[PDB]
Amino acid sequence: MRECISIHVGQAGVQIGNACWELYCLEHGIQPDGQMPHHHDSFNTFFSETGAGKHVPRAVFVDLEPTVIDEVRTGTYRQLFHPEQLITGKEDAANNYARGHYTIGKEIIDLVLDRIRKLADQCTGLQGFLVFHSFGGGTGSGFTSLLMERLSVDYGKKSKLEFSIYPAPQVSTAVVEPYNSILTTHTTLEHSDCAFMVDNEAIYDICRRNLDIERPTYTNLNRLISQIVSSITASLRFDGALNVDLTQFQTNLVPYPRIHFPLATYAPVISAEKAYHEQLSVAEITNACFEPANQMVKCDPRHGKYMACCLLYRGDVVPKDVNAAIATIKTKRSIQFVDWCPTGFKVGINYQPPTVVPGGDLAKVQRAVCMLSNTTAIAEAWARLDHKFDLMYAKRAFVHWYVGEGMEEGEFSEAREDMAALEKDYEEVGVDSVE
Amino acid sequence: MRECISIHVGQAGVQIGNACWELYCLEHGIQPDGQMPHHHDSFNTFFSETGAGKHVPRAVFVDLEPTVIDEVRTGTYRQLFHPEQLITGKEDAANNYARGHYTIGKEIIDLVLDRIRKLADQCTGLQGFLVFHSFGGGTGSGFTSLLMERLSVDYGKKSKLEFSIYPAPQVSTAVVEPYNSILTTHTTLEHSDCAFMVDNEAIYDICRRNLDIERPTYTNLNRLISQIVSSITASLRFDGALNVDLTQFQTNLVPYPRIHFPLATYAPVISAEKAYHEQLSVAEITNACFEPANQMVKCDPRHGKYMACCLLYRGDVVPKDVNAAIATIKTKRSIQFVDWCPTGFKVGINYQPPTVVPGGDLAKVQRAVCMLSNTTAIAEAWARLDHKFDLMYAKRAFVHWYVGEGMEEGEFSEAREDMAALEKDYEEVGVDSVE
Amino acid sequence: MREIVHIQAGQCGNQIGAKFWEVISDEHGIDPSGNYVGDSDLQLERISVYYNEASSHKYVPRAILVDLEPGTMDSVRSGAFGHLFRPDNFIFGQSGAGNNWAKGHYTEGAELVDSVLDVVRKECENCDCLQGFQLTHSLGGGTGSGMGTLLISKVREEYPDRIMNTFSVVPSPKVSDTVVEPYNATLSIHQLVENTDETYCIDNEALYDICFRTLKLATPTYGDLNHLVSATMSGVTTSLRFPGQLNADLRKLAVNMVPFPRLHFFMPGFAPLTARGSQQYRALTVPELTQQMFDAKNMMAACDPRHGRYLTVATVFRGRMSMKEVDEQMLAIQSKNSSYFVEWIPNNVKVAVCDIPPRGLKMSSTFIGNSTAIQELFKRISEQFTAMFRRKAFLHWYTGEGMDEMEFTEAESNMNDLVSEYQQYQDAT
Amino acid sequence: MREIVHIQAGQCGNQIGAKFWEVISDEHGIDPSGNYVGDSDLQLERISVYYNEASSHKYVPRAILVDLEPGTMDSVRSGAFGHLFRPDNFIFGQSGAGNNWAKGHYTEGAELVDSVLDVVRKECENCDCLQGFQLTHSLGGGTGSGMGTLLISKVREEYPDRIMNTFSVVPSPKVSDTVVEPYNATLSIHQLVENTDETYCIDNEALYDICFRTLKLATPTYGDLNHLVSATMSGVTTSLRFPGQLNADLRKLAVNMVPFPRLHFFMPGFAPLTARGSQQYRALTVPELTQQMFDAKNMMAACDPRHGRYLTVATVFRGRMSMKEVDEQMLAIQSKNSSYFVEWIPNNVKVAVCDIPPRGLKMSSTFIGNSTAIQELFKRISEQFTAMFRRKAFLHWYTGEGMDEMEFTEAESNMNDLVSEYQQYQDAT
Amino acid sequence: MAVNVYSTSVTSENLSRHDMLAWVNDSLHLNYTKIEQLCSGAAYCQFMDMLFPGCVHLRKVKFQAKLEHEYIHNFKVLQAAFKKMGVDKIIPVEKLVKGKFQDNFEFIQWFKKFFDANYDGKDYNPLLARQ
Numbered sequence A, B: 001m002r003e004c005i006s007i008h009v010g011q012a013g014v015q016i017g018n019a020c021w022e023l024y025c026l027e028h029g030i031q032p033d034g035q036m037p038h039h040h041d042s043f044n045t046f047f048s049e050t051g052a053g054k055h056v057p058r059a060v061f062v063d064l065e066p067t068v069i070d071e072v073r074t075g076t077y078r079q080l081f082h083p084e085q086l087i088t089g090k091e092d093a094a095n096n097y098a099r100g101h102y103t104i105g106k107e108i109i110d111l112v113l114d115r116i117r118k119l120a121d122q123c124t125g126l127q128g129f130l131v132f133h134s135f136g137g138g139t140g141s142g143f144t145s146l147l148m149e150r151l152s153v154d155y156g157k158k159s160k161l162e163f164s165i166y167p168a169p170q171v172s173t174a175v176v177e178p179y180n181s182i183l184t185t186h187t188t189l190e191h192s193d194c195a196f197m198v199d200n201e202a203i204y205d206i207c208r209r210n211l212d213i214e215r216p217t218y219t220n221l222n223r224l225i226s227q228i229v230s231s232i233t234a235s236l237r238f239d240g241a242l243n244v245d246l247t248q249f250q251t252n253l254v255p256y257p258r259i260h261f262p263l264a265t266y267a268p269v270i271s272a273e274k275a276y277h278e279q280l281s282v283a284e285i286t287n288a289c290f291e292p293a294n295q296m297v298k299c300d301p302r303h304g305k306y307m308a309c310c311l312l313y314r315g316d317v318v319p320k321d322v323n324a325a326i327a328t329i330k331t332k333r334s335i336q337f338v339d340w341c342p343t344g345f346k347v348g349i350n351y352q353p354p355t356v357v358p359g360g361d362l363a364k365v366q367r368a369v370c371m372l373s374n375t376t377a378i379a380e381a382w383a384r385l386d387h388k389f390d391l392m393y394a395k396r397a398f399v400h401w402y403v404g405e406g407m408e409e410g411e412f413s414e415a416r417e418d419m420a421a422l423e424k425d426y427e428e429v430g431v432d433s434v435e
Numbered sequence C, D: 001m002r003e004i005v006h007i008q009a010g011q012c013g014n015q016i017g018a019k020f021w022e023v024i025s026d027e028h029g030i031d032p033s034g035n036y037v038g039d040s041d042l043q044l045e046r047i048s049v050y051y052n053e054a055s056s057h058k059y060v061p062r063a064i065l066v067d068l069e070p071g072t073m074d075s076v077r078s079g080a081f082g083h084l085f086r087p088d089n090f091i092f093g094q095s096g097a098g099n100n101w102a103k104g105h106y107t108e109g110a111e112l113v114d115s116v117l118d119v120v121r122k123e124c125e126n127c128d129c130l131q132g133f134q135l136t137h138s139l140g141g142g143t144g145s146g147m148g149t150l151l152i153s154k155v156r157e158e159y160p161d162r163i164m165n166t167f168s169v170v171p172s173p174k175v176s177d178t179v180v181e182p183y184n185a186t187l188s189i190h191q192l193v194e195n196t197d198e199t200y201c202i203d204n205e206a207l208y209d210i211c212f213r214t215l216k217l218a219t220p221t222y223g224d225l226n227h228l229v230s231a232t233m234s235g236v237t238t239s240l241r242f243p244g245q246l247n248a249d250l251r252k253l254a255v256n257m258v259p260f261p262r263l264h265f266f267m268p269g270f271a272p273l274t275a276r277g278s279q280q281y282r283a284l285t286v287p288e289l290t291q292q293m294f295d296a297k298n299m300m301a302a303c304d305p306r307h308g309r310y311l312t313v314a315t316v317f318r319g320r321m322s323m324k325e326v327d328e329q330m331l332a333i334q335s336k337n338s339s340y341f342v343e344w345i346p347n348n349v350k351v352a353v354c355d356i357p358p359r360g361l362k363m364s365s366t367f368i369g370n371s372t373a374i375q376e377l378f379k380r381i382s383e384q385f386t387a388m389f390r391r392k393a394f395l396h397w398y399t400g401e402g403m404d405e406m407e408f409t410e411a412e413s414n415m416n417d418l419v420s421e422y423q424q425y426q427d428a429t
Numbered sequence E: 001m002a003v004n005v006y007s008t009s010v011t012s013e014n015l016s017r018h019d020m021l022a023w024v025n026d027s028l029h030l031n032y033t034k035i036e037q038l039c040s041g042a043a044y045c046q047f048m049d050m051l052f053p054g055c056v057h058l059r060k061v062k063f064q065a066k067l068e069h070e071y072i073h074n075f076k077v078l079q080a081a082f083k084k085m086g087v088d089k090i091i092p093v094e095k096l097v098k099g100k101f102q103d104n105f106e107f108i109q110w111f112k113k114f115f116d117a118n119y120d121g122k123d124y125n126p127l128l129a130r131q
C-alpha cells in the first residue's frame, strides 16, 4: 500500500542494485522467473503484481555505457525486470562530469523522466526515491545531479534518500575524483533530504578483519551494502513492535539544512566458523556496532562528537535489554554527545529476523542491528577532499577537458567556495559555544 | 555467578594450560567437541555456555612464536577454544627480556587487552585473573610483566595469582636465566596479590621417587602441576562443609605486602600398584604433605620457619580427624612457627573427590590435600639467584643484547638493589625482634 | 446508562487498547467472536457502558482506533481478537507523522480529524446518556501526540459539559526513544493542560523496573507492560462498571482528586504484584495490600513521592473485604506517613470499594495519587526543551509546515508557569 | 503472640540454622512441604511464635538467611527441606568477605545491609507483638562476624526496647580454623558487649570432646555437630511455646542471668547425652539429669568451671516430673558444691519446668551458667591479638578498606577492661 | 600532559576513611559528612580545575544534582576532562552513581594518589570559583 521507487545510476549503482534485488527476491520468496511457490501486503511495496502471478520490481536502471546493462539483461535475472525499464545510452561519460551532465546526459534525461513518471503514476501511495550512485564516476555524478534537479522540479516535497560511495583517502581508481566529487557535492547539496555515505576501503578492512576473507571481490562489498539497505527498508516492508518510516529517518537524523551526511554501520558481521563460539546478545551486538573500527567510512568517530544516532534492531529483540544496553552505551566513555542534544537515540525494533543469501559470506543470525550515525568526524573527510581538489586545481589540470565539454571556471570557483562554506558551518555547529 | 579468567603466556604457560584445561573438561563432564551427555551452576565459572549446548572456555592463549599455538589449534582440543582467543605473533623474544617487553611485545599488547576486555565485560561477577607464566623465558617474563602493568591500570583491585616456574638450582635449560628472573621479579613485585612458586627440579624427584617413574617427560610434570591448580579453585566450582574463595587465599597467606611468595605441595602422590597396600587415612596424608622431601620447590623448610599455612582437603573427609591431625602436627618438633603468628593454619574441606585423567600416573584417591606454605625458607632461593646475577653482571656479560633492544644499563642497577631490599626484608621479619 | 466512548491514537494507543479490550472481554465474559458465553448475570447487568448491543445478540465495542500509518491496523485486524471490532471505526491514513508536531496537527490532522469527528458524532448520537471520553496515547510520538491533541480540542469544543481521561505515556529520563522528544512533549502537554480534565501519566522505565524487580521477569516485553497498564485502566473503570458497597464514578474521582484547574496529573499504581513462584508464601490481606500499594518502588511513574508531598490520594479496592479494616489501615498509613501529606488539606484520602474481584485473584486495589513529584518531570522536560530551542535545533522542520517561534515561546512560558505554581503550592503553610 | 525473628549470618549460621528448623518442624509436626501433619492440638496453640500463617494453611518460618557469597544458599535451596523457606528472605551477595572485618562491615556489608533491613522491617509490621531477635553467627569469619555485627548495630537503633540473643561460635584455643582469628574476634566483641542483651558462647572442640567420649562417636561430621547446638538453642525457647507448671520466657532468663550490663556471656549445656548402645542400662530420672549436666565434662564451652565460680545459673527442664524432685536436688547441688558459687549472691539457681518432652525422650534439660571462668577465654584471645598487633602483621589488609590504627586500640582497651571486671567480682567479698 | 599512577596494594600509604573525608572537606571548604555522598561528582570536577587551570568548563556542571539522571551528566564532563589531559583511568560510572561505599571508596583512593602527583602547591578560594 506504500510504494517507494529506486533509481540506479552508473555501473556501481547497477551492480549494487543487482545485489540488492537478489536479496529482496530471496527475502520475499519470489522466484527469479517472477513466480512464487508478517508475510501474506509485503511485496506490494516493491514488486508490482501483474495480471498473472508474475511480480515486476519498481526499479529504473539507467546507464550510458551499455556493457553492464547488457550483462544484467543476459544475466540470470532476465525475466524479472521490465525490459522497457532498463535504459542504456551509447557512449559513457568517461569520468567527465561535464560530459555526463551537459553534453551527453541531456539526450536521455527526457526518456528517463518519462519512465519515472509512468512508474510513479502506476502507484498511488508514493513515498520516496532511493538513488544508488557513486561519486567518482562521471556518468554517476552527472546523471545524479541531473536527476536530482529534474525530480525536485517535478515532485515538490518527497523523501529522496541516496546511497553514495565516498572516495577512499588512499585507495583510488580514478584521477579526476576530487573534481567530480566537489562538483557533485556542490550541485546536489540542496536537493537531497538525507544521503547515506559508504567507502570502499573501510568495507575492505571490515571484510578482511571481521569476516576473515583474503579474496574480497566487489560482490562481497555489494552484499554488505545490500544488507544495510534491506535493514533500513525492513520497517516499511514488515511489521514490528515499534515501526519507523523514511520520514522518521529523515526528521530524526537531519538537524540542520546543510548537515545531512550520516554514516552507516551493520552488526554482527561474523563468519560461519566463528558463529558457534559466540552467544550474540543484544548488548554485545550494540557494543560491536558502536565500536569505532566497525564503522563503514574511513574515519574515527572518536575524533569528533556524535550529533544523532538511529538504531534499528531486527529479529528476536526484547526492548528491555535493548534499553538497558543503550543506557550502558550512553554511560560509556568513548561516546560523547554535543551539548545541545540531550536526547540522542532513536530506536526501532522489527520482528523479522534477517535472511541469508545462498553462498554468501555471512552466517545466519537471529539478531541484527543497523546503526545510522550523524556525527562531526565527516568534517575531516570533507577537508581532505577539499585539499586534494585545491592541490589539483592550483595549476589548472584537466580543466581543459572540463571547459571543452561546455563548462567554465566560474563553476569551479563557486563549487570551491560552497564547499568551504559547508566545512565552516559543519565545524562551527559541532564546536561548543558559551551561553 | 562467579567468573575468573586465565591467561597463558609463553610456551610454558600454553603447555601447562593444554594439560590443565584437559582436566577441567573431565571434571565437569565436557566432551572435547563441546557437548555433554554438585551439578544442578558448576561450569559457569569457567565455561561460558553459548547459544547451543556448546561450552567455550574463558581462556586467552598469547604467544609470540606460532610454533606451539599451532599445535594446540590442530590438536585434539581443536573445536573447544574460541578461534579468536588464540593470539600469536610473528617471532619469539629469544630468551631476551627487553625484546618481549619493549620492542616486540609492545606491538601485540593492544590486541591482547582487546580480547581481555571483551571477555570481562561479558561476565558479571569477575573475581580475578589466573596467570600461568614461566620465569626464564623471554615472552614468559618480559611480556608477562607488560600484562600486569596494563591489567592493573584497567582493573584497580582484583585478585591476580601467578603460577610461576622458578629456575632450578642445578638444572638449567637456558643460560641468561639470572638476567631474566631478576628483572621480572623487580617489575611484577608491585602488581601481584599472591604468586605460587613451582620448580621443575623438585618435581623430577617427586615423580622419580614417590610415583616411581624413570621416564618423566614434560607431559607427566604438567599433569602433576595441574592438580594443584584445580584444588585451588575447587571450592568455587563445588560445594563443601567449609568453603574458601579466591580472596580468602590472598588474606591468609600474605602478612606483609612484599612477602607474597608461597610454595605449593600435593598429597597423596602414589602409583597404581602401591595404592592397595596403603590405607590412606586423613591423619597420614597431612603428615605426608608436611615431609621435607614432598615440597614442590627445591628447598628444605627445616632451614627456616613457617609464617602461615593453608590446607585444602577434598573427598570423604570428616572435620573431627582433620582438627585432630593438625593438632599432632603442631606439637611435632620438626615444624616450627614464628613468634608473632600464634594461629598458623587455615583449613578448607570439599565434598568432591579428585578425578583422574585416563592414562595418568596417579591412582584413584578418595582424599587429597593441597598445601600452600608461606615460609622463610624461600629466602635461600632469592639469595642463590642474586649470587648468579651479581657474578655475571660484574664484568657486563650478555648485556649488549639487552641494552641494544631498548633498555639502559641504569635499569639493571635499580632491579639489583630492589631484590637486595626484598632479601633482607624477608630475613629481618622472619628473625625475632627484641621486646 | 453512563456509556464511555474510547479513542485510541498511534501505535502505543493501538497496542494498549488491544490489551485493554482483551482484559475487558475477559472481565465481562465476552467470547472473541463477540457473543456472550459467561455465567453470572451481574456481567450482563451493565454491559452498555463499554460494549454496544447488536443484532443476533452480538456485542461490539464502542472504540475508535485510528492512526496515520496502516501497519498497526493491519496487525490488529489480521491478529486474533480482531473479529469483534467494527470495521467502520478502523480509520487510517497513508503516511506517518514522522515524529513531527506539524505533520501530526496540521498536515494530515485535517483529513483524519474530519473523518474521526464524523465517526465520533455518529457514535455519540447512538449513545443514550454519555458519561465521558477515554483517550490512550503517547507524548513522544508524532501521530499519537499531535492527532490526539487535535481530537481532544475538537471533542472539547463539541461537548463542553463532559469529562475525559487521557492515559498518556510520558517520556523516560534515562533513554529517549526518539531524538526530538521535548518539542512534541512540551506542545502536547501545553495543549492538554489547556483543554483536558484529568490525566494519568504513565512511564516506561518505571514499568520496566516494576516488572523486573517485583514481578521477577527476566525478559519483560511490551505485552507485559501493556498488561499492567490495562489492569490499571480496568481497575479505574470497574467502580461504575460493577456494583459495590461504596460506589464511585469518574466524576467522583475527578472532583475528589483535582483541587485546582491546572493540577490534574496523577500517578497510578496497582496491587498486588507477585511473581509466579512467590504467590503461595504470601497471605492475601488488606494490610499487605495497602503496604504494597503505598511504597514508591510500586509506582508506575518514574518519580519518587519521597521527594514531594501527596496533595490527594484515591484508592479503589476490589473483591470482598471489611470497611473497618480498610479505613483503619488508611488511618494508620496517614498517621505514620504524615510528614509526606499536605497540611492544609485534612483527611486527604478518598476510598471506594467494589464487589467483583479481578479474574484469578481474591482481591486487588488501584491507587491514584495526585502528588507534587510531577514537578520534577516537568522541570526536566522544560530544561531539555530550553536547551534545544536555545540552540535552535530541529526547528526548521516544525516551521516548514506551518508553525513559528511564537508557539514554542508561549508553550515554554506555560510550562514554566505551571511548574512554578505546582512548587509554590507544595511549599505553602 | 510474642513471636521472635530469626536472623542467620555467615556459613556457620546457615548450616546451624538449616538443622535448627529441622528440630522446630519436628516439634510442631510440620511437613517439609510446609503443611501441618501433626496429631496433638497443643502444637498449634502457639504456632505464630516461630512460624507464620499463610494461604491454604501453609506455614512459612520467620527467618532471614543472608550470606555474602552464593555458595550457601545454593545448598539450602536445592537441598531437601528448602521448599518451605520464603524465597524473598534468601538474600545473598556475590563475593565473600574474605575473612576480613573491613570487607564485611564497611565495604561489602554496606551494599547488602540496606536490603536485609527492609526485609526485617517488613516482618515486624506483619508481627503482632514482637518479642525479640535471634542471631546465629561466628566470631572468626568475615561475613558472620563483620556483617552480623552490622545488623546488630542497625537493628538495635530501630527497636531499642527489645531483647535479642546471639548464639555465637567463639574461637578455639588449640587449633585455629583461620589464621587471622584474633583480629576478627577482638573487633567483634568490642561491638557485642554494647548492643546485645545476652550471648551464648559455644566452642568446637568441647563439642568434639562431648561427641567423642559421652556420645561414643569416632567420626562426628558437622551434621552430628550442629545437631547438638540445635537442641540447646531450641530448649531455651520451648518455655513459651508450650504450657508448663512453672513457665519462663526469653526476658525472664535475662533478668536472672545478667547481674551487670557487661556480664552477659553464658555457657550452655544439655542433658541427657547417651550413646545409642548404652541407653538401656540407665533409668531416665531426675537424679542423674542434674548430676550429668553439672560436671565440666558435659559443657559446650571449652572452659572448665573449676577454675572459676558460678555467678548465677539457670536450668530449664522439659518433659514431665515432680517439682519436689527438681527442687530437692538443686539445693543438694548447691550445698555440696558450695565452694564454686559466689557468696554475695544467695540462692543463685533459677529453675523452670515445661510439660512437653523432646522427641524420643521422657525428660531432658538445658543448663545455662553465667560463670566467671569465661574470663580465661577472653584473656587468651587478648593475648594472641596483642602479639600480632605489636608486629603489625596482617594489618595492611584492614587499613586498606577503611579502618585505622586508632580503631584497634579502642577495641583492645575495651576488651582488657571487661576481663578486669570479670575477675574483680570473683575475688570480691 | 599529565602523569599517571596505578594503585594495587600499598602499605603505610593508604589513609583512613575518616582522614580521607577531612582532606576533601578541607580542600574545598564544604560539609560532606559521608564519603558515599561523593556520588555527585561535583567535588571531582572541582579537583581537576584545581590541578590544571582550565581544561574543564565549570559552568557545565551543577552542584545541586539530586536525581539518577542528573548524577550522570556531572560525570560526563569529568570524562572529557580526563581525555583532554590524556589520563587513562576508566571511570566505572555505572557503579559510582549507585552511591555505595564499595565503589565510591576505591575511586577516591585512586584519586588521592593522582592528586598528589599533579599538585604544584597553588592555592585559591573555591568559593568565588563555585559562585
Ligand SMILES: Nc1nc2c(ncn2[C@@H]2O[C@H](COP(=O)(O)OP(=O)(O)OP(=O)(O)O)[C@@H](O)[C@H]2O)c(=O)[nH]1
Pocket (backbone or CB within 6 Å): A010, A011, A012, A013, A015, A016, A065, A092, A093, A094, A095, A096, A134, A135, A136, A137, A138, A139, A140, A165, A173, A174, A200, A218, A221, A222
Ligand atoms: N562499492 C562499489 N563501488 C563500485 C563498484 N563498481 C564501481 N564502483 C565505484 O565506481 C567508481 C568508478 O566510476 P563509475 O561510477 O563506475 O563510472 P562508470 O559507471 O564506469 O561510468 P563513467 O563515469 O562514464 O566511467 C570507482 O571509483 C568505484 O569506487 C562496485 O561494484 N561496488
Ligand SMILES: Nc1nc2c(ncn2[C@@H]2O[C@H](COP(=O)(O)OP(=O)(O)OP(=O)(O)O)[C@@H](O)[C@H]2O)c(=O)[nH]1
Pocket (backbone or CB within 6 Å): B009, B010, B011, B012, B015, B016, B064, B092, B093, B094, B095, B096, B134, B135, B136, B137, B138, B139, B140, B141, B165, B173, B174, B200, B218, B219, B221, B222
Ligand atoms: N613445567 C614446565 N616448564 C616448561 C615446560 N616447557 C618449558 N618450560 C620452561 O620454560 C623455560 C623456557 O623458556 P620459555 O618460558 O618457554 O620461553 P618461550 O615460551 O619459549 O619464549 P621465548 O623466551 O621467546 O623463547 C624453561 O626453562 C622451562 O623451565 C613445560 O612443558 N613444563
Ligand SMILES: Nc1nc2c(ncn2[C@@H]2O[C@H](COP(=O)(O)OP(=O)(O)OP(=O)(O)O)[C@@H](O)[C@H]2O)c(=O)[nH]1
Pocket (backbone or CB within 6 Å): A241, A242, A243, A244, A248, C010, C011, C012, C013, C015, C016, C067, C068, C069, C096, C097, C098, C099, C100, C138, C140, C141, C142, C143, C144, C145, C169, C177, C178, C204, C222, C225, C226
Ligand atoms: N506502553 C507502551 N509504549 C509504547 C509501546 N510501543 C511504543 N511505545 C511508546 O510510544 C511511542 C511510539 O510512537 P507513536 O506515538 O506510536 O508514533 P508512531 O505510531 O510510530 O507514528 P509516528 O509518530 O508518525 O512515527 C514511542 O516513543 C514509545 O516510547 C508499547 O508497546 N507500550
Ligand SMILES: Nc1nc2c(ncn2[C@@H]2O[C@H](COP(=O)(O)OP(=O)(O)OP(=O)(O)O)[C@@H](O)[C@H]2O)c(=O)[nH]1
Pocket (backbone or CB within 6 Å): B241, B242, B243, B248, D010, D011, D012, D013, D015, D016, D067, D068, D096, D097, D098, D099, D100, D138, D139, D140, D141, D142, D143, D144, D145, D169, D177, D178, D204, D222, D225, D226, D229
Ligand atoms: N558449629 C559449626 N561451626 C562451623 C561450621 N562450619 C564452619 N564453622 C565455623 O565457622 C567458621 C566459618 O567462617 P564463616 O563465619 O562462616 O565465614 P564465611 O561464611 O565463609 O564468609 P567469609 O568469612 O568471607 O569467608 C569457621 O571458622 C568454623 O570454625 C559448622 O558446620 N558448624
Ligand SMILES: [Mg+2]
Pocket (backbone or CB within 6 Å): A011, A065, A092, A139
Ligand atoms: Mg562506466
Ligand SMILES: [Mg+2]
Pocket (backbone or CB within 6 Å): B010, B011, B065, B092, B093, B137, B139
Ligand atoms: Mg618461546
Ligand SMILES: [Mg+2]
Pocket (backbone or CB within 6 Å): C010, C011, C067, C069, C096, C097, C143
Ligand atoms: Mg506510527
Ligand SMILES: [Mg+2]
Pocket (backbone or CB within 6 Å): B243, D010, D011, D069, D096, D143
Ligand atoms: Mg563464606
